[PDB]
Amino acid sequence: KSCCSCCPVGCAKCSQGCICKEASDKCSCCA
Ligand SMILES: [Cd+2]
Ligand SMILES: [Cd+2]
Ligand SMILES: [Cd+2]
Ligand SMILES: [Cd+2]
Numbered sequence: 001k002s003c004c005s006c007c008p009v010g011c012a013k014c015s016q017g018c019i020c021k022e023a024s025d026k027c028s029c030c031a
Contacts, residue, residue, distance in 0.1 A: 007031060 003014040006023035013030040
């Protein structure tokens with residue numbers, strides 16, 4: 001885990017702020 005369970009790796013969109021709050025197995029706001 002880095003930021004979320006869908007972007008557990010300081011994802012870009014999740015650079016410095018888990019701005020991804022939607023993905024119960026997959027997201028479409030980032031990757
Ligand atoms: Cd995520
Ligand atoms: Cd993200
Ligand atoms: Cd996140
Ligand atoms: Cd996302």
